[PDB]
């Protein structure tokens, strides 16, 4: 609908390599802008770069592409599906945003996390550090990273995934935790709060170099007749 937007998208389509399906993305951008559609779907189009995005979109579906960098994110955006890309960094995240799935990428550092972030999936990345988690965050996925430590968890957090990392110590887990994915790390001990989780919570700490005092304590607590904590898997 917009003349400047259509001109920019036409130039972007005309400036694409043969491997990219820029005609389909161009037509879909025109359709989304004309109808003010809430969701823009450009996934599995072998796109390497993206032009200026429609400002009214709330969900961005750009997974399974060859994108290395992303343009400015619209301020009304809420959910991002940009997994399976070649992204090295991410732009500023909108405040209205809630959902990211940036797994299977080559990012090294994350920008500031929005206050309304709900679920985070940055697995299979090259992160060496994490930003401070938002208070409302419920799920974070940082599996297969190079993290040496993890920031303190919020009190509304329900799911944690940190397998295949280099974390040495775990902060105290909130009672809202119901599933902890913690295998393949350099952990020598577990915080006591892991014993205070709900009975139906799931925790696996296999592959961790837990000390003898730690496994003695865990064996004493978990095998007790009055134990009501979560089920912990060591293998």
């Amino acid at each position: 609908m917009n003349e400047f937007y259509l001109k920019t998208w036409s130039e972007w389509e005309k400036n694409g390599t043969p491997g990219e399906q820029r005609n389909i993305a161009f037509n879909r951008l025109k359709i989304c802008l004309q109808n003010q559609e809430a969701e823009l779907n450009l996934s599995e189009l072998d796109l390497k770069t993206l032009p200026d995005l429609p400002p009214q979109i709330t969900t961005l579906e750009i997974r399974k592409n060859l994108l290395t960098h992303l343009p400015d994110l619209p301020p009304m955006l809420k959910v991002i599906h940009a997994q399976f890309n070649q992204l090295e960094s991410l732009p500023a995240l909108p405040e209205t945003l809630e959902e990211l799935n940036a797994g299977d990428n080559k990012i090294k550092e994350l920008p500031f996390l929005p206050e309304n972030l709900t679920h985070l999936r940055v697995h299979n990345n090259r992160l060496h550090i994490l930003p401070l988690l938002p208070p409302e965050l419920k799920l974070l996925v940082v599996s297969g990273n190079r993290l040496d430590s993890i920031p303190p968890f919020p009190d509304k957090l329900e799911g944690l995934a940190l397998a295949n990392n280099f974390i040495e110590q775990l902060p105290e887990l909130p009672f809202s935790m119901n599933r902890a994915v913690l295998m393949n790390n350099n952990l020598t001990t577990l915080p006591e709060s892991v014993l205070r989780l709900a009975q139906n919570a799931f925790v696996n700490v296999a592959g961790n170099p837990l000390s003898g005092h730690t496994m003695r304590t865990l064996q004493q607590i978990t095998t007790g007749p009055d134990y009501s904590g979560p089920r912990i898997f060591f293998s």
Partner: protein, 1221 residues
């Protein structure tokens, strides 16, 4: 020379042969530095000297430019005229170079200088010929490389220029003609180009030559490091994983680009580059192989198996994802996405096969390539720069740490740490004065790995093993005379006396004591060689009782007992003996306090505790003279009655009969108990059959013919007596139907007068080519109108006289080193049948000696000092082959006999050869099964032996088997190096031991070339003597023109008939070589060769008193020997080469004939040199935490180094070596 062409100088052959004997005279008339002068004076005072010296001016050069042409024609075989011209100019350059420093440079040149130049520069000229015959194109490009390569002739530079032409051709023709062919071409050039690059080949080279050598080394590095890529990766990645094939061709060229600017891989720059190309190709192809790039699954952190592409698109293996497959939750650790619990996970095989298959193959090719790069980095004489070694040893860890198998990747991890020796050995190949810091750093970061367990005695025994191997295969076995100084030098490191310096000290002391051990344990009777073995012994004397550490003597006792046996060590220390020096014990007083019984191990203890109880009961019955308890002990135990009888007979031998061995007749069994035990064999119903009862009664009263009043002098008839009595028991009480031939070989061995004894040489020309064909008048013709060369019969190549013999065919056991068999039997099983036949004939040579005298076909005088010294040789060979100690080898013989006995589940005469073959192959199926069970049954035997009451008090019986810390309160125990595991005795590695590992870890289908080399290695080291017996077999034919009456028949007279002693000395040195080769190979010729030799011919050894008709290679009579020997050597060589015309898989026929034969075309490999250290090097040791180091030979690498250093390709065809009078 072709038709109508003549010699360049008249009578060119006589001049050359005249000069080549004046040179021989000058050899012994003076020393090495006197030759260049004396040869010239000798040829200058000769009449030909003035005949030529009168000629002056440029005519001189004329003659010379002719002579050194014809010389080449009379010494080499120039394929074309261009090669002849190139060799001419090369030899002219060499001659001028020699004349440059001659006290008369460029005044007048003379004929002897050509001979001097060729003799000094023979290796370079022949290597040049090899280069120009591997690929002729090199000469073509070299043809214009005289204007292109301005050739100023003052030194031999032509070979290096040819090397550059060839290597530029290689660089400009990479992968071009079906890269397999390029691979074979570079591998064929490997030897000549490396020799050119080798420093000890171009000693006298000049500045230009040194520069061109530098340049050719620079190109050869990249050509050869790339070369191995082309071998492991391209050639092979994709025979199997195809999609990658063309893909790999993309990166190979890139590899050269990475090495194009610089190719010095043993440097920071170039090495950090190869590593990079390789990593990149790996990643790129992994990506291609799959849509998203393949990576191992999260929880398993191993690989991927039976997976499925979930909505998470993460192939996660089933039984590892069982945490979610059993708790019934539906997320994967990577994505955590969850569709509701209703979906059923499964297996996607098409993806699964690809992932699993790619992983195994990708990991193998890359590892091979990396290994081959570290071994072109660790090559010449100095370790790579500090950064290179730091990056190498730092690559062993993942930061599951330190589970990396020396790979530049980061994806494969095995398990909890497995410390390997791949990096330590290639780093220790140099001297222990420049790699000390590297190894100490390696072990210091090794102990900080993951809190290595405190029980660190199986890690130090890995570093000590690797240090000992390097010391023993780096300078301990390379020398020929320097040992005379080494034996003194180690003596020095006995006058002045855990980190790596201390570990090296410990290993060197262990090897010093190891050599002192087999200097201390050699058969007495030849007492000589005083200086070395007594100065060294006194040095060890002062070292041991000067250090005050009582562990070295413990190691000495352990090595002595593992070399000769327990009894030798026990008898080595008895107060007051003259042969006794009580050195290695510090325990003489304690053993002398318990001197009533020195100690005898019941080696029959491999039966269970049942025989252990029966022997105790029998001993009690005998000493109390009340034997009725035996009659209930037999009832107390419970086995099949045959085993009952065998155990009882062995008990009488061990407790009753053996007492008739002590010279102290007072200790002999008094008749009081003998009467009772004889009576109770009488009332024994278990010994119901007559023969067993008679044998038992004979054993009790010492009336068994084997245990006669006079046995052998020492305890050689002691262990053999034990084995023979066990064989007696097994044959008497055994019920198996295939034991009958061994029974009849004993027990009246007169029926077995016309039977083929098992494991005897067979007529190889009976079961099944290029071999010689027979003319109607019995003459072996050449390879196969055409007529016979001799007697001119109307036949030509273009009956059933089976030479097999019955009885004991082989002769003097004193000449016997390696076992060679047929009929597809393992050497271990083959020996243990040749040891059970000698154990069924020695007992047979006790009832009637004359009957066996008619069986041993090379007749002897006493078939009881013959067969016992034969069984001693059998045991010595078995010890080397299995690697166990002497006592354990007697034990394995006993265990094999037990397996024959405890077996309760085709002829009884062995009348026909095929029937003997069938009996062999049917007893091999019973001997073999619990012969591979020697890793668990032997420890059980050792426990039962060093657990019994008889010896579990002797000090020496605890040093050998138990732990000396328990009973000796004088061993220094402060450090880890003082534990009784480091000072234990390992098994020495020999060529014969490897012949057992190769055929155990199946090697008739996995390493065919190594198997065909090892199983014929005994007589293959004699092939290198072919260029010597093809020289005196052609120097005689020339000398012996047709005289048709060679009357004289004594080589000694011929050797004395020559004047000018030096010449007869040379003929003596050659005839000795021929005689040594014939005497050391004659026995195999008569039953293995193809030229039918009269059976008397290969019967007795030859020396300098036989007929002169031997040497002449005539086709009939005495000359058939000197033809059969050469034919057999040629057959061995071409058989090995044909075995190489395998896996290389491409036909290649150099096909040198037996008149051009030189040192290059024969497999020339002395055993202590290249063969022994190479096998020691590839022995790699892996230690797993909580587990002892495991010896692991790498058979593929050994085979590759064998074929790429001796067996590349050099085939042969027999068409001469004949009296062309």
């Amino acid at each position: 020379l072709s038709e109508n062409a003549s010699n360049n100088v008249p009578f060119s052959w006589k001049i050359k042969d005249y000069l080549e004997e004046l040179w021989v005279q000058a050899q012994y008339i003076t020393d090495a530095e006197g030759l260049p002068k004396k040869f010239v004076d000798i040829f200058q005072q000769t009449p030909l000297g003035r005949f030529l010296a009168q000629l002056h001016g440029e005519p001189q050069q004329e003659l010379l430019q002719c002579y050194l042409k014809d010389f080449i024609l009379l010494t080499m075989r120039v394929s074309t005229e261009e090669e002849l011209k190139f060799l001419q100019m090369a030899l002219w350059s060499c001659t001028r170079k020699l004349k440059a420093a001659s006290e008369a440079p460029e005044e007048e040149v003379s004929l002897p200088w050509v001979h001097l130049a060729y003799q000094r520069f023979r290796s370079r000229l022949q290597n040049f010929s090899r280069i120009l015959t591997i690929y002729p194109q090199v000469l073509h490009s070299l043809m214009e490389a005289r204007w292109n390569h301005e050739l100023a002739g003052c030194e031999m530079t032509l070979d290096a220029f040819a090397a550059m032409a060839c290597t530029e051709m290689l660089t400009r023709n990479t992968l071009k003609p079906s890269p397999q062919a390029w691979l074979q071409l570079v591998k064929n050039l490997s030897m000549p180009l490396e020799l050119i690059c080798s420093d000890e080949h171009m000693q006298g080279s000049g500045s230009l030559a040194q520069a061109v050598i530098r340049e050719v080394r620079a190109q050869w590095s990249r050509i050869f490091s790339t070369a191995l890529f082309v071998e492991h990766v391209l050639l092979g990645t994709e025979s199997r994983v195809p999609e990658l094939q063309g893909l790999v061709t993309e990166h190979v060229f890139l590899l050269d680009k990475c090495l194009r600017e610089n190719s010095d891989v043993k440097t920071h720059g170039p090495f950090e580059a190869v590593m990079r190309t390789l990593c990149e190709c790996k990643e790129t192809a992994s990506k291609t192989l799959s849509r998203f790039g393949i990576q191992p699954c999260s929880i398993c952190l191993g690989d991927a198996k039976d997976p499925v592409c979930l909505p998470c698109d993460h192939v996660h293996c089933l039984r590892c994802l069982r945490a979610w497959f059993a708790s019934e939750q539906m997320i994967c650790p990577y994505c955590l996405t969850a569709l509701p619990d209703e979906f059923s996970p499964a297996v996607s095989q098409a993806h699964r096969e690809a992932i699993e298959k790619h992983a195994r193959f990708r990991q193998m090719c890359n590892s091979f390539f990396v290994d081959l790069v570290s071994t072109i980095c660790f090559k010449d004489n100095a370790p790579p720069e500090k950064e290179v070694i730091e990056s190498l040893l730092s690559l062993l860890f993942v930061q599951c740490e330190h589970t990396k198998s020396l790979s530049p990747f980061n994806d494969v991890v095995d398990k909890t740490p497995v410390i390997r020796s791949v990096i330590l050995k290639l780093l220790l190949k140099y001297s222990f004065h420049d790699v000390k810091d590297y190894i100490q750093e390696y072990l210091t970061l090794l102990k900080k790995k993951a809190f290595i367990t405190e029980d660190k005695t199986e890690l130090y025994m890995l570093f000590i093993n690797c240090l000992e191997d390097s010391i023993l295969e780096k300078t301990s076995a390379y020398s020929r005379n320097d040992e005379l100084n080494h034996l003194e030098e180690e003596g020095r490191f006995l006058k002045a006396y855990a980190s790596v310096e201390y570990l090296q000290e410990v290993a060197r002391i262990r090897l010093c004591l190891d050599r002192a051990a087999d200097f201390l344990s050699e058969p007495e009777g030849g007492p000589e060689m005083a200086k070395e073995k007594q100065c060294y012994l006194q040095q060890v004397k002062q070292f041991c009782i000067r250090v005050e550490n009582d562990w070295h003597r413990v190691y000495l006792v352990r090595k002595l007992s593992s070399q000769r046996g327990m009894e030798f060590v026990q008898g080595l220390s008895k107060p007051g003996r003259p042969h006794q020096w009580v050195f290695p014990k510090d325990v003489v007083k304690q053993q002398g306090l318990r001197q009533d019984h020195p100690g005898q191990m019941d080696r029959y203890l491999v039966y269970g505790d049942e025989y252990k109880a029966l022997r105790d009961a029998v001993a009690k019955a005998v000493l109390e003279c009340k034997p009725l308890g035996i009659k209930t002990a037999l009832k107390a135990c419970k086995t099949p009655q045959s085993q009952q009888s065998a155990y009882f007979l062995l008990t009488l031998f061990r407790e009753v009969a053996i007492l008739y061995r002590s010279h102290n007749a007072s200790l002999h069994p008094t008749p009081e108990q003998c009467e009772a035990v004889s009576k109770f064999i009488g009332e024994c119903k278990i010994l119901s059959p007559p023969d067993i009862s008679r044998f038992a009664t004979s054993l009790v009263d010492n009336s068994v013919p084997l245990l006669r009043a006079g046995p052998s002098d020492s305890n050689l008839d002691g262990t053999v007596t034990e084995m023979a009595i066990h064989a007696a028991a097994v044959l008497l009480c055994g019920q198996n139907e295939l034991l009958e031939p061994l029974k009849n070989l004993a027990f009246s061995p007169a029926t077995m007068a016309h039977a083929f004894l098992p494991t005897m040489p067979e007529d190889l020309l009976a079961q099944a080519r290029v071999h010689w064909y027979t003319c109607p008048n019995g003459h072996p013709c050449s390879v196969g109108q055409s007529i016979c060369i001799d007697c001119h019969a109307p036949i030509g190549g273009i009956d059933k006289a089976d030479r097999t013999q019955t009885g004991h065919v082989l002769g003097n056991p004193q000449r016997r080193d390696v076992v060679t068999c047929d009929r597809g039997l393992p050497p271990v099983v083959f020996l243990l049948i040749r040891l059970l036949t000698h154990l069924a004939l020695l007992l047979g040579a006790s009832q009637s000696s004359q009957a066996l005298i008619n069986i041993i076909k090379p007749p002897v005088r006493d078939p009881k000092g013959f067969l016992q010294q034969h069984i001693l040789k059998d045991l010595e060979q078995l010890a080397k082959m299995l690697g166990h100690s002497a006592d354990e080898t007697i034990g394995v013989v006993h265990l094999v006999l037990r397996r024959l006995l405890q077996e309760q589940h085709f002829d009884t005469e062995l009348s026909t050869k095929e029937m003997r073959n069938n009996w062999e192959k049917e007893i091999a199926a019973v001997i073999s099964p619990e012969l591979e069970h020697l890793d668990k049954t032997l420890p059980t035997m050792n426990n039962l032996i060093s657990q019994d009451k008889r010896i579990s008090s002797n000090p020496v019986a605890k040093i050998i088997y138990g732990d000396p810390v328990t009973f000796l309160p004088h061993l220094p125990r402060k450090s880890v190096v003082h534990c009784s595991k480091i000072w234990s005795c390992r098994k020495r590695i020999t060529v014969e031991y490897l012949q057992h590992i190769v055929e155990q870890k199946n090697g008739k289908e996995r390493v065919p070339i190594l198997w065909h080399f090892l199983q014929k290695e005994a007589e293959l080291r004699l092939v290198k003597f072919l260029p010597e017996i093809l020289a005196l077999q052609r120097d005689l034919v020339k000398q012996f023109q047709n005289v048709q009456q060679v009357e004289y028949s004594s080589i000694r007279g011929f050797l004395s008939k020559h004047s000018s002693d030096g010449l007869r000395q040379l003929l003596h040195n050659r005839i000795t070589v021929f005689l040594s080769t014939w005497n050391k190979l004659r026995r195999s010729l008569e039953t293995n060769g193809e030229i039918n030799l009269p059976k008397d011919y290969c019967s007795t050894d030859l020396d300098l008193d036989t007929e002169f008709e031997i040497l002449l290679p005539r086709r009939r009579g005495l000359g058939l020997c000197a033809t059969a020997l050469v034919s057999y050597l040629i057959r061995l060589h071409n058989e090995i080469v044909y075995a190489v015309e395998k896996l290389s898989k491409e036909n290649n026929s150099y096909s040198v004939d037996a008149a051009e034969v030189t040192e290059l075309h024969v497999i020339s490999y002395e055993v202590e040199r290249d063969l022994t250290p190479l096998i020691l090097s590839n022995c790699q040791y892996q230690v797993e935490e909580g587990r002892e180091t495991v010896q692991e030979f790498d058979l593929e690498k050994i085979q590759r180094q064998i074929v790429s250093r001796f067996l590349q390709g050099k085939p042969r065809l027999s068409l001469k070596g004949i009296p062309t009078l």
